[PDB]
Amino acid sequence: KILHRLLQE
Amino acid sequence: RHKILHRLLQE
Amino acid sequence: NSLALSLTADQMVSALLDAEPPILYSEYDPTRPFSEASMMGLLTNLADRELVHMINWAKRVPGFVDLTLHDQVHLLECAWLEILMIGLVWRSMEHPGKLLFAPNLLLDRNQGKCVEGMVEIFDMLLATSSRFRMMNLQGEEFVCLKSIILLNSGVYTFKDHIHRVLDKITDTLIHLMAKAGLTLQQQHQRLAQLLLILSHIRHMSNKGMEHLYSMKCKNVVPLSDLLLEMLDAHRLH
Amino acid sequence: SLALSLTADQMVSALLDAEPPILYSEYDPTRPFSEASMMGLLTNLADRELVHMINWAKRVPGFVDLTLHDQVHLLECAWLEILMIGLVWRSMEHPGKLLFAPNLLLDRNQGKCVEGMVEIFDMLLATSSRFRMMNLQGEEFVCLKSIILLNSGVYTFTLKSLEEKDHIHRVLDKITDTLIHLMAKAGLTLQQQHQRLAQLLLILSHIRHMSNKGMEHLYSMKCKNVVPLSDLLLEMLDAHRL
Ligand SMILES: C[C@]12CC[C@@H]3c4ccc(O)cc4CC[C@H]3[C@@H]1CC[C@@H]2O
Ligand SMILES: C[C@]12CC[C@@H]3c4ccc(O)cc4CC[C@H]3[C@@H]1CC[C@@H]2O
Numbered sequence: 001k002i003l004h005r006l007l008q009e
Numbered sequence: 010r011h012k013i014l015h016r017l018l019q020e
Numbered sequence: 021n022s023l024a025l026s027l028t029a030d031q032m033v034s035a036l037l038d039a040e041p042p043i044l045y046s047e048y049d050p051t052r053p054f055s056e057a058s059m060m061g062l063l064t065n066l067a068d069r070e071l072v073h074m075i076n077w078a079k080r081v082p083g084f085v086d087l088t089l090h091d092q093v094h095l096l097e098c099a100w101l102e103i104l105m106i107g108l109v110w111r112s113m114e115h116p117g118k119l120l121f122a123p124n125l126l127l128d129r130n131q132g133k134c135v136e137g138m139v140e141i142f143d144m145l146l147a148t149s150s151r152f153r154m155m156n157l158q159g160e161e162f163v164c165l166k167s168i169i170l171l172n173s174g175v176y177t178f179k180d181h182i183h184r185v186l187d188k189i190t191d192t193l194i195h196l197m198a199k200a201g202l203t204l205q206q207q208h209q210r211l212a213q214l215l216l217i218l219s220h221i222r223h224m225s226n227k228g229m230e231h232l233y234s235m236k237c238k239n240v241v242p243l244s245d246l247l248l249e250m251l252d253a254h255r256l257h
Numbered sequence: 258s259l260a261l262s263l264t265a266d267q268m269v270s271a272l273l274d275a276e277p278p279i280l281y282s283e284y285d286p287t288r289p290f291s292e293a294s295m296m297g298l299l300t301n302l303a304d305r306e307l308v309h310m311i312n313w314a315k316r317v318p319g320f321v322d323l324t325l326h327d328q329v330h331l332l333e334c335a336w337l338e339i340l341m342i343g344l345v346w347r348s349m350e351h352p353g354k355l356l357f358a359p360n361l362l363l364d365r366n367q368g369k370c371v372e373g374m375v376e377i378f379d380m381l382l383a384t385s386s387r388f389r390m391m392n393l394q395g396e397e398f399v400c401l402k403s404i405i406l407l408n409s410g411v412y413t414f415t416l417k418s419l420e421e422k423d424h425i426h427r428v429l430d431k432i433t434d435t436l437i438h439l440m441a442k443a444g445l446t447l448q449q450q451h452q453r454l455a456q457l458l459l460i461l462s463h464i465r466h467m468s469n470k471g472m473e474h475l476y477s478m479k480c481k482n483v484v485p486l487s488d489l490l491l492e493m494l495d496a497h498r499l
Contacts, residue, residue, distance in 0.1 A: 001329065001492055002488060002492055003311070003333065003489070004329050006489075007311060007314075007325060007329065008325070013246040014093055014246070014250070017072060017075040018075060018089060018092055018093065018096075019089070020076075144413065147412045148412065151412065168459070173462065173466075176380070176387060177379075177383065186455070186459070187452045187455075190451055190452050191448065191452070194451050205434065207451070208434075208450070208451060209430045209433050211455060212454065213426075215458040215459060216404070216429070216458060217412075218461075219408060219409065219461045219465045220412045222465045222466050223409075223469065226466065226470075
């Protein structure tokens with residue numbers, strides 16, 4: 001998910 | 010408006 | 021001037037305990053398993069009967085009858101499902117993993133599956149029951165929280181009188197926690213913990229109202245005129 | 258956990274420092290409003306705000322101690338409540354209007370531009386009015402917003418996966434401590450402190466209600482193809498499974 005990725009970025 | 014709630018609240 | 025504001029904390033606690041509605045039974049027919057229609061039938065038949073007692077209870081909550089009829093109607097229309105739900109969660113607290121709708125209707129989550137879209141709601145209610153159990157929620161605290169829901173849920177869709185009564189119930193909750201031996205820090209932390217659960221109860225009621233609306237539309241079962249009117253107040257149509 | 262070792266003053270400082278910026282809308286006063294363009298402006302704005310929200314959440318003490326899956330769940334649950342409380346806060350000093358952005362201030366009549374919207378505007382305006390009545394302070398607002406983040410999804414998440422939750426309750430307790438600290442420093446009596454604490458937390462029930470209604474509204478706009486929603490916004494909406 002995009003949210004998962006942004007929480008990683 | 011007629012409402013059963015009215016009737017119950019006025020008992 | 022409202023008499024409610026003159027009550028001591030002990031007087032408020034006794035009045036709320038005195039006002040408590042009875043615990044009702046479901047049907048004695050032991051036919052299992054349920055169908056979607058038979059389960060929704062029992063649950064809505066029960067809710068309808070409980071609503072009549074809920075109205076009687078509300079009239080005995082200090083401060084409620086000082087409101088106009090219109091304001092009383094508004095608060096009950098807004099809060100009725102939250103109130104049924106917190107009652108269910110309370111009854112269920114001592115039965116981990118089950119929902120005690122009635123003494124002869126104790127259901128687990130698997131039975132939630134009997135009805136389309138229901139197990140998600142059962143899961144939320146069970147989580148709330150578990151949280152109350154782990155907090156060792158007391159009966160005196162429960163009746164305070166239930167009256168708070170009645171007075172609060174509809175108050176922003178309308179004033180000072182209601183807020184003054186809510187303040188009195190807060191004082192009463194803190195009194196109970198002090199009496200139970202909690203430190204000042206423990207009292208405010210617990211007050212916060214309990215009020216935050218009310219957010220979840222609102223969420224469950226909103227989901228439950230959408231679920232009941234879908235059942236009405238599917239013509240799953242016959243709903244009482246009273247139940248239909250309480251559902252219609254939420255304007256899902 | 259550093260989060261649990263913070264004093265009340267340090268908690269306040271951390272939350273104030275973490276505050277996201279106030280973004281501008283693409284509003285062009287020359288373009289006549291339509292249902293589509295208004296929903297366009299609001300959802301374009303929400304989408305940009307979501308990126309800042311994600312990075313704000315990372316700075317709320319205790320949040321990054323959680324597993325990634327738990328962080329995802331909490332933001333999926335809370336995002337619209339968080340947008341809403343921010344909007345109500347920005348609007349507090351503008352009675353009767355909602356300050357979506359400094360260049361996008363809307364009143365209830367303008368809400369009628371979009372089907373089903375005015376009822377949601379009215380709820381938001383009432384919350385703004387309530388904030389005004391209570392004289393909500395900035396330090397209190399940031400505490401409430403962090404409570405929404407931590408609380409809204411905490412009851413909808415193995416025994417090992419159960420005490421991920423205990424840490425959340427501990428951080429929530431610290432924020433309660435912080436709210437009480439702010440009120441005591443403001444000169445409120447013990448009785449006034451618990452009364453105000455309850456008044457503030459009861460507003461969260463209303464904010465949950467508004468978010469549930471707003472989520473159904475957004476879902477309706479999607480189904481109707483009123484405007485295209487960003488991929489992020491669609492994902493955040495889909496998490497609610499309407
Ligand atoms: C409203 C529902 C039927 C009646 C149910 C009930 C019925 C009686 C009661 O005491 C509590 C509840 C809570 C959950 C309710 C259900 C939630 C969804 C379902 O439609
Ligand atoms: C989600 C909605 C569009 C985006 C709106 C928004 C957009 C940005 C913002 O900061 C706050 C809000 C709150 C109300 C939201 C609306 C409620 C219903 C509507 O669909």
